[PDB]
Structure formats: structure tokens, C-alpha cells
């Protein structure tokens, strides 16, 4: 019944700091070392560090070395990492991830389901949707929000489900991000949105 | 950095898609070396170049 | 540092296959190789370390095998779950090393991509941007290229797209494309083409609209 | 004792495209690892040594790399005259392994075989032996198959194919097979038929003549 | 100006002997070691045996180690192999080559022609001829078939009547049969009775008359 839950991410600025916390549960957390794994958009995995039970030891990747500091406190059983120095290729997931025994060999067999670590030189904000029409299908423009944690959903006048709801991933343009839903429908129905910094709903029409 | 498209063109009809990623040669030779794992119960195979260089058929016999 | 050298990156199979999946080492690591499975949006999950000892709920058709600077992990018949990405790690020495990663993917048969554009909406054209949107739905392989024409005039550095994932259903991908610019660019051209290409097509197929027509 | 292995076996390219071929070890021969191009009826020439060093006189367009068990031998863009089979060899110890080797042929549009068949000459058969010869001119790819049958039945463990290189002129092929047996035995049958298979015909081909008829 | 020369292969009879030789020019023969390499009809190259400038270190593979002798006479600048209880086995076409550095890991910068050897019972004899008119039940095809000759070292050439040369022909590698050697020629051509067909060999030359419709 392992769980650890990452948090503590959130948008940063270049330069300035965060520190991330992970909360153990299911097992006893003072025994076992503790690892940071990292994945940027589209990436793959990337080895942030790790530290032993009773802190003996640390080590950290030459990306983040002297830039992190990793930490624990096995008396209320969480873990953590101080990032310093943050810059935008910093921009990833956290994850946090036990070790299955004793030993430095051991593999990571439980891990959390990460924070979101945002390093921009924009504040956090919510989408402004706009209607996609042709000149069937419709569709809805999410512009500018950040972080990039953005949710589609569909209803018709009669405020219900929209079936055909098809979403592609944000693009990166100008520090914000934007992202687009398609909704087809067979030959104005509404556009909600989902984010942290504030939900938004839209009236995309038919022609 | 390029992407090396193979076509795993097996003997016993199916066809496998398979990309590579690195240095054109470091890209090609990783390919092989993979043709060459799947020949170890594949049979003995052939290869023929597509566009310029970037596809590669491996057919196995 | 020792190097790890995944590969494929991607490949393609279809439901009961053998797939085969190579993890090379820079320098010998005994063995201390970990597989582990990632999906989605979703944390990784370990599926054989020791280079071949398999962790509890895996299905046996998950086998691992090598020594010192070779790995193979083996899926003996794919199964629908089994379709994700896959990444080696050595945990002989620190710093950790993970692999580049394999996407395995369903493979389907070639299918076409249906076009639509999509001009800015006028709301948005008082923000001062505009963004035209093209879209490309349901098309396999992802290859998959779309080219922008402002009366007639290739465009670059100035479109950005993105590619959703596997369909549960029909295995196909579609694609959004975005030619963004100001109403600065934007009201002084009439002719806005997007030009699709696909395997599943012969010849490029285009989809426009004159602005002010419609 | 170190094994050579080279790949792949042969390789179908066209001019001015870039090539990299295998070759890899059992044990480290840490960089003495060599290579050298061969042309039909011509010795072997030095083409690069200690794994990355062009011999003097060898064009710029070659190159080499790798050490210990792993090397690679690249050609920026294929010239006409580049095609030949290259031999990669190790020179880290006695005895002094070979590769098997690497043929490079000319890849070019699928061309039908045109068959042909001659039936023996009078003056061969007044000395005992009969031997019948199929011809299959200027086909591509090499892959070819011929299926001989003495009154519909099928030979097997008498006949013998002969193929050419490459022409100089149009990159095809040309094979020859030659069924051979006694006149006794070549008088105690009538229909001499020759069937071949190719990528390039829609359907088998089949050339044969009646005993005496010709 | 390096240059390797080899000679005094031939026909033999399998379980004699035979010694090859390679004359060097166009470098200091004295300082470099020596290679010899062959290559049997048809496939790879194989590595034979090589020794060191001074004669002290010999090497063998190991399929000729115990038969296979190789010696120098720096004096001479020659290369030498001696051959004890010649195997079919043993039958190719033999190269030298020397190695590019005074190191031993060197490689081999320079080969000679080569000289070919055949070991076969059969003795040394020129083809025979024989035509080969097309039949069956695009343009008319011709060929010519040559056989049980030995060594294998023939050339095809074809001319017309009026003696112009015909320039279409193939080039099918020659197969063993019977102890010996056959190949045959096919010329293409499109719209005089008969074409000439000639072959070239160390053991004579033959000519020969092929019919046309």
C-alpha cells in the first residue's frame, strides 16, 4: 500500500528557488533511500539524485549538482529537494521514488505521480478560449495560460455531454502556452476549460 | 541528429516499423546491430537504401 | 557517467508479437539493469531489475536476460496493455543512468488525414493576434507534414503543431497546426492555403480561404 | 581466435547516397581493425586503417569509426565507381581474421528477365553428355528462380546456375542455368521446359522445346 | 613505386608441392613484414601466413600450419611460400602484400595481381567448344559453351562475319564439373548465316561457328 505524494511545484521565475516536498506512506520510510527522477515535456527520464536513510550519503546528476540540495526527515516521514538557481530547462515533472531494499544497487519500485515544476518568465494565468468555425467541425482555441495543466470538455445548448471530444497537446509560444479541442459532430454548442489560475467556458457556434 | 526509418520486412509476411535516433552513422550501425539480433531467430537478411539514405529495408529470409 | 545506449526509440507492432527491446552499456555494470514501463501521463512503473528478476503482478510473458554491457528485455506475445514506453536504468554506479526509451506502438494500416482550417475569430482579431488553425484528423503513420501559404507564399518560423496520441479505438493520430501572426500580417494578405501530406495521399492536399469570404 | 562479422551482407543503394556498413567482433581488437575494397578480378586495396585513417590517395567521402568490439566504414555519397564488396579485417593478433564481406550493388527500377532456352548441339551429343541451358537476360533485382522439368517433372541435383555482376550499362543481371545429362538418358524424354520466377514478371515464365524439334 | 609480383602457380596434383614467389620493388623489402593471402574461387579472403623482416617470426593459419612453409631472401627482395601436400582445399588465386609500418598491428597497404593456383588430378587442357543456337515452342539470342578445360582462365570474345566486333555479350563465372571447367556466352542481337565465337586460353586458343536464322 505504498504512496508517495510529490508537491511543491507551482511557476517560478529564472534565478529564483523552490523547494519540493514528498510524503511516504505504506512503509517505513527511515530504512529505505529516497530518489528524485525528473521528464521534461516530451522527454524522456532524467536522474535527479538521491540519499541514503540516515542522510550518510548524497549524490545528484551533473545538471542539478551544485544546484540541489536533497533532504529528509524520516520523523514525519517526507521527502525533499531544494532547488536552487531554477532555470527554464528545469521545466519538468518531479517524481519521487523509493528504493525496493537494502542496498545501493536497489531498483526504484514505487513511485509518486510528480508536481509540476514551471520555470517562466510569465505569471501564472488562465486561458482566454476562442471559437474555432469554418468559413462539421468546431472547435476551441485555449491562448495563453501557464502553467501548462489545461482540461477540455464539451455540452450542448441542452447542457449535457458533447461525445466527440478530440484534444491535442499545448505548444510553447511567447513563455505562455496554448492548446486547441476539436469537437465533430455529424451534418452554437459550448467550450469549457479547465486550470488551475481559474476555469473558463465558451460559446463556439454552428454555421 | 537524424532519424533512421526501417522497415522490418519479415519472411513470414508481417512488416515491424522501427525508428533510430542519433548520429546518421551511430543511427545505422545501431539499426544492424539490431537486424542482427532479430536474424538470430529471423534468418540471415538483405538491406536496400530509400530516400538518400535515411530508410532502410532489412528483409529476412 | 557510463552511457546508455536504448534502442529503438520507436517501434510498431500489432497485439501478440514478439518484441524485442536492446539496452547497451558504456562500461560493464554486472547486472544492474532495471526495465521499467511508463503510459501517458503517468508515473513509470518497474518491471524487472537485476537484469532479469521480474517484481511481483508482471506478467511472465516480461522476461529479462545479459550481462556486464548487453541487455534484452522481451515481451514474448504483446498484449494490448503492453503498449507504452519502455526505459533501461543501471543502478551499479551513481550517477543514475536512464536509457533514451522505447515508444511501442500499435500498428495499423496507411489512412488519410481530413483537413480543416479554420480562420481567426474575429474576437481575437481586436487582441491584436491571429492564429489560423488547420487541422488534420485521424491518420496513420504519424508522418505526417503541413506546409503554410499566404498568397502564395511559403511560410516559416511561424507555425507550431501537435500531435495527439494513439487512438484508443482506431490506433491513428491527428494533428493541429497553427500559422500564428498579427492583424498587422494578417489584413494585409487574402489567400490562406494549408497544404497537407501524408503517405495515404498521392498528391498534397490544400485547404483555404480568402479572408473577407465568408 | 576472433571472428569477423560484417554486415549487412549486401546492401542495394543508389549513386549519391550515404552509406555506413558493419563489422564487429568476439573480443577487442581495441582500434586495429582495417578495411580494403575489392573489385571483380582485381586484388583487395587498403582503404582505411587503425579504424579512422584514410590510406593516401582515397577519396574524402570515406570514413570510419569505433573501437574494441563495435566499427563502422561510411561513404558521405555513393559513386558510380564506389561499388564493390569491402572487407573489413583485424590486425590486433594472429591468426589475422577476414570479414566475410560486404557487396554493394547499384539499386535501380525491378526489370523482367526476357528467357530463353537452347537445346544441346548435335556434335555435344555425338559425345555422350546432353547438357540443356536456360538464359534469363538483364533482369533486376539478382533474386531470381529457376524450375527445371523433363516432361513436367521437376530436376533436382543436376543443373547448375551461373550469374554475372552488374552491368557497366544498365546495373541488371544475367543468369544461366545448365541441366546436364547423358544422351541416354536426354533420348528417353521429349518436353525440355525451364520455369522462372521473378519480382518483375507478373506470373512464372515457362520456355521449353521438344527434343529433335529444334 | 611498390609493386608485388607473384608467380609460379599452376596446375598440380593434389598431395604434391609447389613453391610461389614475390618479387618486391618500390620499397626498402628488408623492413617490412610479409603477407601472403588468398582467396578461393568465389568467396572471401583468407589469410595464409605472413613472417617478420628478419625471418624470426613465421605464422600460419591454421589450416596450412604443418604443410604450408613461408621463407624471404631479403637479398632478393622476394617473397616466398612453399607448399607441402597441396589440398584441393588449397586451390586460389595467391597474394602478397606487405604491411604498411614497421609495427605489427600495421595493415596491409599494398597486395600484389595475385598467382593461381589448381590443384586438381586433371591435366592442363584447353576447351572445347560447342554452339548453342536459341529454340523454344524482343530479337534473336546466341551463345557459345566451352568446357573441360583447366586452369580456369578463359576469355570470350565475339565477332561477325565481316569480322566486327559484338559488343552485348554477359560474363557467367565458370563452374566445376567433372574435375574441370565449363562456361558458357550469350550475345544479344537485332535484325549472313553464322556469328564467330572465340575463346582464350593458356593451353590453347579455339574459334568456333555459331548458326543464325
Known amino acids: 500500500q505504498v504512496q508517495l505524494v510529490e508537491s511543491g511545484g507551482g511557476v517560478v521565475q529564472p534565478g529564483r528557488s523552490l523547494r519540493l516536498s514528498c510524503?511516504?506512506?505504506?512503509?517505513?520510510?527511515?530504512?529505505?533511500?529516497?530518489?528524485?527522477v525528473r521528464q521534461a515535456p516530451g522527454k524522456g527520464l532524467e536522474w535527479?539524485?538521491?540519499?541514503?536513510?540516515?542522510?550518510?550519503?548524497?549524490?545528484?546528476?551533473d545538471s542539478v549538482k551544485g544546484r540541489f540540495t536533497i533532504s529528509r526527515d524520516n520523523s514525519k516521514n517526507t521527502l525533499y529537494l531544494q532547488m536552487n538557481s531554477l532555470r527554464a530547462e528545469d521545466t519538468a515533472v518531479?517524481?519521487?521514488?523509493?528504493?525496493?531494499?537494502?542496498?545501493?544497487?536497489?531498483?526504484?519500485?514505487?513511485?509518486?505521480?510528480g508536481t509540476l515544476v514551471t520555470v517562466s518568465s510569465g505569471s501564472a494565468s488562465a486561458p482566454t478560449l476562442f471559437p474555432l468555425v469554418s468559413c462539421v467541425a468546431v472547435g476551441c482555441l485555449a491562448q495563453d495560460f501557464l502553467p501548462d495543466s489545461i482540461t477540455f470538455s464539451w455540452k450542448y445548448k441542452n447542457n449535457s455531454d458533447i461525445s466527440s471530444t478530440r484534444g491535442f497537446p499545448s505548444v510553447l509560444r511567447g513563455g505562455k502556452y496554448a492548446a486547441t479541442s476539436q469537437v465533430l459532430l455529424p451534418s452554437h454548442v459550448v467550450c469549457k476549460v479547465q486550470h488551475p489560475n481559474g476555469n473558463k467556458e465558451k460559446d463556439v457556434p454552428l454555421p | 541528429e537524424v532519424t533512421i526509418k526501417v522497415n522490418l520486412i519479415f519472411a513470414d509476411g508481417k512488416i515491424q516499423t522501427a525508428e533510430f535516433k542519433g548520429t546518421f552513422e551511430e543511427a545505422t550501425a545501431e539499426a544492424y546491430r539490431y537486424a542482427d539480433l532479430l536474424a538470430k531467430v529471423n534468418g540471415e537478411y538483405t538491406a536496400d537504401l530509400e530516400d538518400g539514405g535515411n530508410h532502410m529495408n532489412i528483409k529476412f529470409a | 557517467d557510463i552511457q546508455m545506449t536504448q534502442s529503438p526509440s520507436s517501434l510498431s507492432a500489432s497485439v501478440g508479437d514478439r518484441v524485442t527491446i536492446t539496452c547497451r552499456t558504456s562500461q560493464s555494470i554486472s547486472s544492474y539493469l532495471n526495465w521499467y514501463q511508463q503510459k501517458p501521463g503517468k508515473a513509470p512503473k518497474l518491471?524487472?531489475?537485476?537484469?532479469?528478476?521480474?517484481?511481483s503482478g508482471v506478467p511472465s510473458r516480461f522476461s529479462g536476460s545479459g550481462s556486464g554491457t548487453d541487455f534484452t528485455l522481451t515481451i514474448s506475445s504483446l498484449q494490448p496493455e503492453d503498449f507504452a514506453t519502455?526505459?533501461?536504468?543501471?543502478?551499479?554506479?551513481?550517477?543514475?543512468?536512464?536509457?533514451?526509451g522505447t515508444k511501442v506502438e500499435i500498428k495499423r494500416t496507411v489512412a488519410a488525414p481530413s483537413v480543416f482550417i479554420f480562420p481567426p475569430s474575429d474576437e481575437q482579431l481586436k487582441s491584436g493576434t491571429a492564429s489560423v488553425v488547420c487541422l488534420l484528423n485521424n491518420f496513420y503513420p504519424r508522418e505526417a507534414k503541413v506546409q503554410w501559404k499566404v498568397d502564395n507564399a511559403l511560410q516559416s518560423g511561424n507555425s507550431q503543431e501537435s500531435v495527439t496520441e494513439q487512438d484508443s479505438k482506431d490506433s491513428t493520430y491527428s494533428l493541429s497546426s497553427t500559422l500564428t501572426l498579427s492583424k498587422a500580417d494578417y489584413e494585409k494578405h487574402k489567400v490562406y492555403a494549408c497544404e497537407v501530406t501524408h503517405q495515404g495521399l498521392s498528391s498534397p492536399v490544400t485547404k483555404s480561404f480568402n479572408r473577407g469570404e465568408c | 581466435d576472433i571472428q569477423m562479422t560484417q554486415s549487412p551482407s549486401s546492401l542495394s543503394a543508389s549513386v549519391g547516397d550515404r552509406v555506413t556498413i558493419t563489422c564487429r567482433t568476439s573480443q577487442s581488437i581495441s582500434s586495429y581493425l582495417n578495411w580494403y575494397q575489392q573489385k571483380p578480378g582485381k586484388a583487395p586495396k587498403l582503404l582505411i586503417y587503425?579504424?579512422?585513417s584514410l590510406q593516401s590517395g582515397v577519396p574524402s567521402r570515406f570514413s570510419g569509426s569505433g573501437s574494441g568490439t563495435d566499427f563502422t566504414l561510411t561513404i558521405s555519397s555513393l559513386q558510380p565507381e564506389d561499388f564493390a564488396t569491402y572487407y573489413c579485417?583485424?590486425?590486433?593478433?594472429?591468426?589475422?581474421?577476414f570479414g566475410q564481406g560486404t557487396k554493394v550493388e547499384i539499386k535501380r527500377t525491378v526489370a523482367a528477365p526476357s528467357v530463353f532456352i537452347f537445346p544441346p548441339s548435335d556434335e555435344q551429343l555425338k559425345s555422350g553428355t546432353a547438357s540443356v541451358v536456360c538464359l534469363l537476360n538483364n533482369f533486376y533485382p539478382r533474386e531470381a528462380k529457376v524450375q527445371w522439368k523433363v516432361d513436367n517433372a521437376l530436376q533436382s541435383g543436376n543443373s547448375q546456375e551461373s550469374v554475372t555482376e552488374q552491368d557497366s550499362k544498365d546495373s541488371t543481371y544475367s543468369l544461366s542455368s545448365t541441366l546436364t545429362l547423358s544422351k541416354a538418358d536426354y533420348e528417353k524424354h521429349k518436353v525440355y521446359a525451364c520455369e522462372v520466377t521473378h519480382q518483375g514478371l507478373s506470373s512464372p515464365v515457362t520456355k521449353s522445346f521438344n527434343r529433335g524439334e529444334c | 613505386q611498390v609493386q608485388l609480383v607473384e608467380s609460379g602457380g599452376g596446375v598440380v596434383q593434389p598431395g604434391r608441392s609447389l613453391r610461389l614467389s614475390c618479387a618486391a620493388s618500390?620499397?626498402?623489402?628488408?623492413?617490412?613484414?610479409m603477407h601472403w593471402v588468398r582467396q578461393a574461387p568465389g568467396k572471401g579472403l583468407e589469410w595464409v601466413a605472413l613472417?617478420?623482416?628478419?625471418?624470426?617470426?613465421?605464422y600460419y593459419a591454421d589450416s596450412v600450419k604443418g604443410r604450408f612453409t613461408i621463407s624471404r631472401d631479403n637479398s632478393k627482395n622476394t617473397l616466398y611460400l612453399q607448399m607441402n601436400s597441396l589440398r584441393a582445399e588449397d586451390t586460389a588465386v595467391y597474394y602478397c602484400?606487405?604491411?604498411?609500418?614497421?609495427?605489427?598491428?600495421?595493415?596491409?597497404?599494398?597486395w600484389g595481381q595475385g598467382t593461381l593456383v589448381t590443384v586438381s588430378s586433371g591435366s592442363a587442357s584447353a576447351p572445347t567448344l560447342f554452339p548453342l543456337v536459341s529454340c523454344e515452342n524482343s530479337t534473336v539470342a546466341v551463345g557459345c559453351l566451352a568446357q573441360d578445360f583447366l586452369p580456369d582462365s578463359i576469355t570470350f570474345s565475339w565477332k561477325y562475319k565481316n569480322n566486327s566486333d559484338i559488343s552485348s555479350t554477359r560474363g557467367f563465372p565458370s563452374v566445376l564439373r567433372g574435375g574441370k571447367y565449363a562456361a558458357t556466352s550469350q550475345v544479344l542481337l537485332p535484325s549472313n548465316e553464322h556469328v564467330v565465337c572465340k575463346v582464350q586460353h593458356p593451353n590453347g586458343n579455339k574459334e568456333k561457328d555459331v548458326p543464325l536464322p
Open positions: 613472417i617478420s623482416y628478419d625471418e624470426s617470426n613465421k
Open positions: 587503425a579504424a579512422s
Open positions: 618500390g620499397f626498402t623489402f628488408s623492413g617490412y613484414g
Open positions: 579485417q583485424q590486425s590486433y593478433s594472429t591468426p589475422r581474421t
Open positions: 602484400a606487405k604491411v604498411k609500418f614497421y609495427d605489427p598491428t600495421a595493415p596491409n597497404d599494398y
